[PDB]
Design a protein around this nucleic acid. Structure first.
Lengths: 4, 93, 98, 108, 81, 97, 82, 108, 93, 4
DNA sequence: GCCCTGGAGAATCCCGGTGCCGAGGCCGCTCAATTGGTCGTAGACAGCTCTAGCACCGCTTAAACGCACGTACGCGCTGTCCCCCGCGTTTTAACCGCCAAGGGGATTACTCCCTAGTCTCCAGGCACGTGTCAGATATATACATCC
DNA sequence: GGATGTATATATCTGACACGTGCCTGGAGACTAGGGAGTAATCCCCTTGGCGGTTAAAACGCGGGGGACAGCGCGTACGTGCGTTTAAGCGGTGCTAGAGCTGTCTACGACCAATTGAGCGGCCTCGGCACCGGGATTCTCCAGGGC
């Protein structure tokens, strides 16, 4: 997805 | 009287993932409602968790457990990682 | 001979048109009158803001659309294409509203 | 002799406020005492969720050649997912519309 | 006073709502059932809203009262404050 | 022989099981299944007996309610026999899927 | 020792008894697999929350209160166990 | 000098406690300060509801020639009403069973 | 450690509507759970009502409004009458 | 009802 | 007689000019977030006790399993008649724009009554023992019910 | 009519419900200091009521094609009963991990005074989006041909  | 909202912070966050996209006022109202709803859910769950174990303080463990209880699937993993990173960076200094 | 579309063709066009827009589908003055009439019983000499009536209209629209989706599913389950009152009754019974 | 003021959000590397969340937690009647690490965690989680929603909505808006974001795009972004559709499954969005679909048996 | 305004919800409006719901063919007895359902829903919501506005010693029903009355029954609504 | 007509013993069973209030599932297989399922989330876990009893009660209630809804759906379509599509429709309408 | 393949312990007569208490008269032959899948999903959903509640308290024994709270989190309040 | 102690529940003519309810309200994190007439009202409401439930359950128990009350009688009393069934429509009662009914189509 | 419940008060109430009927332990546990559940519901609703109006106290009026919102139909009327009678009797002496 |  | 095989009228898509209203940036300034210290309690941590959860073995019987046979039920094919869809004309009331008046929501000062906080003391509610009766069990009628 | 399953009367017997009791923790009584809530006065924003013209939308009528509903036949899948096999339930032993309570003391959060920069309210303007018109492409339905 986005930022981990 | 003066009111408070999350408009400036939502705009700041938007200007980082789409540097050339705007937003209207109705979408801003929807965003404010969404933020308030999520805040209320997490805070209530954390308060209940603290009350069950005969404690009288809210720490980051309660917030982490509430996040793991509410959010579904991979959202929980990502949110937990972001929160841990933020707390570590804050307490390093 | 005048050009006439076969039955059931304009219905699909209407579905495609109304599933793409976002406006309200009920006249505002009759709805406001109905709301005032209903509220007459609980208290008298009441005043309404415009935003309250708008909120009530939006909520009612959403509720009716969802109910109609469930009714269509129930009607299809019984090998039909026409919706009937018993489908509404079954949907409302299973959903827990009765 | 006082050092230069530095906001807690900048110290933690966030965009969402930390003092405001701390004040809301203290004044919301949630518990007797509030720790020093709860606001940072809560602000980080809120920022992450907001960024997720905004990115998906911006993609939806750019899909059909528009510059701004309207509630229809937010509704499309929320309904077209699988985790966000479960988190907001009992929420109505004003002026949102519905997802376009038609049952296969009705089609000619 | 006011009377029998439930007939203001005309048949074409119900047809448009059914079309948005994905329905293709409608019988002739649907409209009365829909009017009854709508009346029941409105009665519940308005009763809760009026109780909320009466607790605060006011004579005007605001949007926040309707929002609270809806949120009470698991019908959270976004965009009205 | 006195072979009853089909569908006669079924009504007797329905009347009998709607009057009692005991559990209808054996306890040891259920306990083993619960332990197997819980083995994934954590290892070396211990259960109180009342916990397994509560889980069994909740499962019984859920299944009975689902079967009532399934029976309603099956009757709606002019049938007596219940089929998987009835369960799927009931679950879809109830909001679980 | 690990545990494997215990979902077959929910035998056909037990499902038939549950259906009889529900009011069903005739049952097809493919109901049992659907019932087993539904039960497995429900049990996983409840047990995950129960184990999370147990872990938060730094314990190794799952109590009845954890199960009660996990059920309450899904609008399935249960009376009798506390 | 101090006169003889008189309990608040006795002064209000009730059977349920008033001091215990006040303590629970004060220690439950509900509001900053609690008035003086709230415990009496709450105790009266609780007593009324308990009396309703117990009377109906006792009638159900006495129906079938029994002296003690068991959870089956409570389940019958709750499910056989119209307004108590609505108040407790999402509650499961242990060792309660179901209400005896059969669909008319199934019956021969 | 000693705990507390509502067994004695439930027994006292039972000995006014059926003077020749007893109760087992499981039914007593069920009654305890029911009383606790209703108490929590009413208290939470009253707290929310007090918070909505920028007040910082809980009085009998919030309790009355919460009872009106929660209980359905004739139960609300009967409960309101009982509460008002109890409060006025308490205040009179 | 009761206690009228 | 059938399976295509092109035209015609309506619906949908695409492109250019326009003007107007809302989104986005700039400036005072004031209330809320920051920095530095102090104190009294909540929670971390180590040690001891004893409840209750896990492991094992033998046996008696209730419940699950496997195979056969016949009948009640699900499902596909036909035909008919009522009811809902598509379209053109007439009639009704929604909607837009502008004015005027008064009820009711929002803000400020102030003064008194209601609730939090302490100390003492004494009676109501909990843990512990127990003796008896409501309830469960077994067996012989005896009447309601299915093929 | 008769096999099978269902309702009923009686000795009895064991475990669970109701009653007694010592005592100790939580509720009651009297007094006080300060902040929350009740009350009167005032300003102006937002709700209610009214009038006229026009044009979009609702109501009424009619022909006919497609869909709901009833009826009949056949073949497979589910219900009922019986002999054989598997493991659930019950009672009893023995060992130890882990839940629950207690005493010490240290680090962490509440509280208060000063200082200042981040965020809210108020004008201003230009570019993104709504609306209009004409032309190019697409979708549907009925008429004909020979395979």
């Amino acid at each position: 997805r986005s930022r981990t | 009287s003066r009111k408070e909202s999350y408009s400036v912070y939502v705009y700041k966050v938007l200007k980082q993932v789409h540097p050339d996209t705007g937003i209207s006022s109705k979408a801003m109202g929807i965003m404010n409602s969404f933020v308030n709803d999520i805040f209320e859910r997490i805070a209530g769950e954390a308060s209940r968790l603290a009350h069950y174990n005969k404690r009288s303080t809210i720490t980051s463990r309660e917030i982490q457990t509430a996040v793991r209880l509410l959010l579904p699937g991979e959202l929980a993993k990502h949110a937990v990682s972001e929160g841990t990173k933020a707390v570590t960076k804050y307490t390093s200094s | 001979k005048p050009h006439r579309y076969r039955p059931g063709t304009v219905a699909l066009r209407e579905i495609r048109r109304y599933q793409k827009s976002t406006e309200l589908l009920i006249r505002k003055l009759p709805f406001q009158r109905l709301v005032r009439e209903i509220a007459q019983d609980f208290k008298t000499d009441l005043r309404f803001q415009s935003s309250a009536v708008m909120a009530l209209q939006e909520a009612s629209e959403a509720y009716l659309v969802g109910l109609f989706e469930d009714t269509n599913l129930c009607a299809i389950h019984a090998k039909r294409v026409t919706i009937m009152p018993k489908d509404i009754q079954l949907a409302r019974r299973i959903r827990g509203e009765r | 002799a006082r050092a230069k003021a530095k906001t807690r959000s900048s110290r933690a590397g966030l965009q969402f406020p930390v003092g405001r969340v701390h004040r809301l937690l203290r004044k919301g009647n949630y518990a007797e005492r509030v720790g020093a690490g709860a606001p940072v965690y809560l602000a980080a989680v809120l920022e992450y969720l907001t960024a997720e929603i905004l990115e998906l909505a911006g993609n939806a808006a750019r899909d059909n050649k528009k510059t701004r974001i309207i509630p229809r795009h937010l509704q499309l972004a929320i309904r077209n997912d699988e985790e966000l559709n479960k988190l907001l499954g009992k929420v109505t969005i004003a002026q949102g519309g519905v997802l376009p679909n038609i049952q296969a048996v009705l089609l000619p | 006073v006011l009377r029998d305004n439930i007939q203001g919800i005309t048949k074409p409006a119900i047809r448009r709502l059914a079309r948005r719901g994905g329905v293709k063919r409608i019988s002739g007895l649907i409209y009365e059932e829909t009017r009854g359902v709508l009346k029941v829903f409105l009665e519940n919501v308005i009763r809760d809203a009026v109780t909320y506005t009466e607790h605060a010693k006011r004579k005007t029903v605001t949007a926040m009262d309707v929002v609270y009355a809806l949120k009470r029954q698991g019908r959270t609504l976004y965009g009205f404050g």
